[PDB]
Amino acid sequence: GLKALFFDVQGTLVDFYSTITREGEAFSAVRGFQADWTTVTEQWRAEYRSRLDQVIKGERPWTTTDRIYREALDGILANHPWGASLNSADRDELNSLWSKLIPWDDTAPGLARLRSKYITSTLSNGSMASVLRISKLGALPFDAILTAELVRSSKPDPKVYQLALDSVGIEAHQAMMVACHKYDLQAAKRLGFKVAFIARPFEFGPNKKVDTKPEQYFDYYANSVVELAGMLGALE
Amino acid sequence: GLKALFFDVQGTLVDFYSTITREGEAFSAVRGFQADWTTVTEQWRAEYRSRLDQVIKGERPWTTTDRIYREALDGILANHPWGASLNSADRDELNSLWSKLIPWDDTAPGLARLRSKYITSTLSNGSMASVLRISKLGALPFDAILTAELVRSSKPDPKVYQLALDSVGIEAHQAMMVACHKYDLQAAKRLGFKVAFIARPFEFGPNKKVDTKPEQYFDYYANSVVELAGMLGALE
Ligand SMILES: [Ca+2]
């Protein structure tokens, strides 16, 4: 009997691409600048992923994801003419967008229906501070906020998923992992979780290949959190 | 400026005395025993607190709060003549009441007013699973659910208060600890937190004397979460 649902956040529930682009161009429209924010996002994510690789590879000490995004921003703005005009405080403002990630239109209605039938919680690699603020700013209801920062690691570390089971007080087969990333669902299913895949074809913006094809080990396959709620029988 | 409020749960927000005594009485009606549940309650908590102190002093391995309550229950049932007539399943049902504690009348309206103005989170010694279920069952809104289980300790360990600051991403002077127990606010105020004391004159039942006098280090003294919300300017 399913009892709790754990949701990945970035990409699965929120649209970080549209957030960085539209809030960046407004950030540059206030000071007077001109930059391709689509290429800014890829570089920021690349530096963010170039540096978190080092953390678990041992080439960088552990630090919250907000700090990694802030430091990655310093590395990418060195390759931009307007980057020097942004002081230490201007770059903190830019970095705070990761705590303001805009939700997909189906996220709030689907989460509310699921919470009325199950225990719901986050389980993502982001910082607790950012995920907390993303859910509060977006009025996304959860019964708890859990990130891998609570065990100083990141998915697919088995102890991140054990954190979910220990915190909610249930066994693996009573829990479901919801995500748009297949490495997440593979690791959770290995540990006995149920897994629900949410196809997010626009996660990385236009002209990007996204693997959304169904897999046999998926317990559920949906194109929205609202659709997943209907499959689980979580009505209005 | 205040940014986040952290709440103790047991006693501060929920009435465990009334939950145990009444639900224990209802539990006993269909099983054929009558007991004085005001003494069973304080025997349970005394047994729990003694086994908990063994975990703290290193004389017993760490387990969740629910497991200590469950073993304390086995302890007190051995001292009552009707204890043997309760099998393991009956005792798990009795022990589950620690996850169903009813809130005080003021808790739900006060938390919602405070959440519309601040980030709010729990920060108690209970288990994550029980505090999570207490808020879900009682419709107590929090932006986050934190307990000392997340650092495998107990207040007033400074690690528990640092967990609150790390998870929400603020500094001590921007956080307030809200509790009905003075030991909690003493440690938090020592660590830079603001502190709000909520007087719960009936935390331990009708005729047990309770320390509710004001203290000079309190930033706020209230008799309800509703009153604290008014003192902080958080109107409906
Ligand atoms: Ca919440």
Numbering used by the authors:
A (entry chain B), B (entry chain A): 41 to 276
Which sentences from the paper describe this structure?
All these three CESH[L]s exhibit high sequence identity (>60%) with L-2-haloacid dehalogenases, which are members of the haloacid dehalogenase (HAD)-like superfamily. Studies have shown that both RhCESH[L] and KlCESH[L] adopt a two-step catalytic reaction mechanism by 18O-labeling studies.
Furthermore, residues from the core domain surrounding the catalytic pocket in KlCESH[L] can be superimposed well with those in RhCESH[L], while some significant conformational differences are observed in the residues from the cap domain.
